[PDB]
Design a binder for this molecule. Structure first.
Ligand code: UW6
Lengths: 300, 237
């Protein structure tokens, strides 16, 4: 069980860790989060009390280094940093653990939610979508744009998701215009899976990462990407059986975790109605269709 | 974006553009089978591709053999239309290729866009105008060439005959759409009007009769009266 210690909490802030969150008051003696489950990526995120503008946070994996948060009063945000002195980090964390200044990652033993939302998410892939190679952790916020959004404007601050465009030469073989537009199997299986992602696990990892950035930061371009990656599978007539069964599980837990009140801005009516009721895969997403119909019947 | 009454004069500027109408591509007659079910039999169709500035009509005849063994023909018809329009564009010299293509029906937007991916600088536009190009098959010489075709074929026409020698494109297009609207709302009456005087003939190399300026004013008035009348005969006014 690893730890993200905090130097201090000089400004009032709502702190998120994965799907949990807690409020910290201005200058409250808060010094971090302990008992973080090893083996998954995690995200630690922030929403300032005085400016709900800009949710932001850091994707990290405690196996990759010792990370701590310190507020920067010049740039005005909580920054993640890596401690290279491992003896200093141990002594600092222990000091804080003994003074009971840390909150405990509040995981219920039976609860597989985070695993199910991050099953295929790897830090190495995150760091290729979020390019800042001098750090082992990745910053994301509400306002960062995707490479595809910027094509339709700071390149260093972009989310480099795989570009998916159903009306592009990449998606449409010359001489197969109708076939490839109406059945995207070529584009899914040959161009994207075999060509770009190499395997379905990397595809699903990017899909899950895009969903989490949409949910935790309201990042609009991430939501676009999540929906595009779902629609490309649902609009393919030929999808491996194991991918369809896994997608149903992936989506079920995404829909299950979504705040009931954010479904008006996080879910795209056209995509979901097409996927569940018209597409080739309308009959292959039984768990997702059942939770969607019981939780969000208005959208449909 | 879309083409409407506000940007109407754009049709007659010097940017090459084409209207595409697919309403006569897939044509059928519905009939009963011996067992009392219903079946369709296809007849030859056509793509109606028109330069509104010059009158040049690119009439691509769609022979019934193109449907043989195919499913979802009304869907296929839109993609076949887009395949043929794209082939036409590719066949034209660069300086003759359109800058814009306006489809009369919005369901042609995605098929045409996809077939024209290679031409990113040709704009594919819909229109809010209700154009009467479905009535193209009420023009006897166009109907004749479509029904006689025994194989796929392209035939080239000028739908304005020689009108541009005397009138502008704007006026020629207005005349064409009045004639077609009339033929569409009451084909019998429209054709009665156009031929009633036997001294006025259709030249072998023309589609419409050889009316003088004054006789075209009379004809155009009679077509308006017809359209208004049908509008009353319809709604009772
Ligand atoms: C909280 C913390 C941890 N490690 N090194 C630091 O300087 C500060």
């Amino acid at each position: 069980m690893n730890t993200v210690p905090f130097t201090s909490a000089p400004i009032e802030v709502t702190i998120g860790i994965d799907q949990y969150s807690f409020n910290v008051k201005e200058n409250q003696p808060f010094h971090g989060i302990k008992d973080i489950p090893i083996g998954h990526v995690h995200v630690i995120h922030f929403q300032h009390a005085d400016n709900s503008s800009m949710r932001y946070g850091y994707w990290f994996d405690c196996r990759m280094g010792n990370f701590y948060i310190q507020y920067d009063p010049k740039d005005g945000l909580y920054k993640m940093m890596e401690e290279r002195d491992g003896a200093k980090f141990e002594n600092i964390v222990h000091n804080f653990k003994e003074r009971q200044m840390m909150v405990s990652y509040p995981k219920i033993d039976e609860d597989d939610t985070w695993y199910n939302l991050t099953e295929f998410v790897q830090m190495d892939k995150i760091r290729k979508i979020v390019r800042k190679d001098e750090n082992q952790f990745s910053y994301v916020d509400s306002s960062m744009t995707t490479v595809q959004e910027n094509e339709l404007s700071d390149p260093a601050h972009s989310l480099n998701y795989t570009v998916i465009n159903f009306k592009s030469r990449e998606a449409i073989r010359p001489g197969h215009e109708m076939e490839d537009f109406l059945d995207k199997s070529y584009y899914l299986n040959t161009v994207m899976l075999q060509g770009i992602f190499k395997n379905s696990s990397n595809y699903f990892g990017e899909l899950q990462f895009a969903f989490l950035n949409a949910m935790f930061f309201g990042n609009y371009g991430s939501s676009l990407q999540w929906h595009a990656m779902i629609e490309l599978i649902c609009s393919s007539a030929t999808v491996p059986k194991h991918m369809l069964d896994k997608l149903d599980e992936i989506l079920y837990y995404q829909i299950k975790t979504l705040p009931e009140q954010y479904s008006d801005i996080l879910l795209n009516e056209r995509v979901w109605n097409i996927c569940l009721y018209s597409s080739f895969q309308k009959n292959s997403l039984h768990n997702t269709e059942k939770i969607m119909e019981n939780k969000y019947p208005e959208l449909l | 974006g879309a083409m409407n009454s506000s940007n109407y004069a754009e049709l007659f500027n010097n940017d090459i553009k084409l209207f595409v109408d697919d309403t006569n591509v897939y044509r059928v007659t519905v009939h009963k089978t011996f067992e009392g079910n219903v079946a369709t039999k296809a007849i030859n169709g056509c793509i109606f591709t028109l330069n509104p500035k010059t009158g040049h009509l690119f009439l691509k005849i769609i022979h019934t053999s193109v449907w043989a063994g195919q499913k979802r023909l009304s869907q296929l018809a839109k993609w076949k239309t887009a395949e043929e329009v794209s082939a036409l564009v590719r066949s034209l010299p660069k300086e003759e290729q359109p800058k814009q293509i306006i489809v009369t029906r919005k369901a042609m937007l995605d098929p045409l866009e996809v077939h024209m991916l290679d031409f990113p600088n040709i704009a594919i536009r819909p229109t809010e105008l209700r154009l009467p190009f479905s009535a193209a098959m009420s023009i006897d010489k166009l109907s004749d060439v479509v029904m006689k075709a025994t194989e796929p074929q392209m035939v080239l026409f000028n739908i304005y005959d020689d009108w541009l020698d005397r009138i502008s494109s704007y006026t020629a297009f207005s005349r064409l759409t009045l004639l077609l609207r009339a033929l569409k709302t009451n084909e019998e009456s429209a054709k009665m009007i156009l031929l009633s005087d036997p001294t006025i003939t259709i030249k072998s190399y023309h589609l419409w009769p050889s009316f003088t300026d004054e006789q075209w004013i009379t004809i155009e008035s009679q077509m308006r009266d017809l359209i208004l009348t049908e509008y009353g005969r319809k709604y009772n006014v």
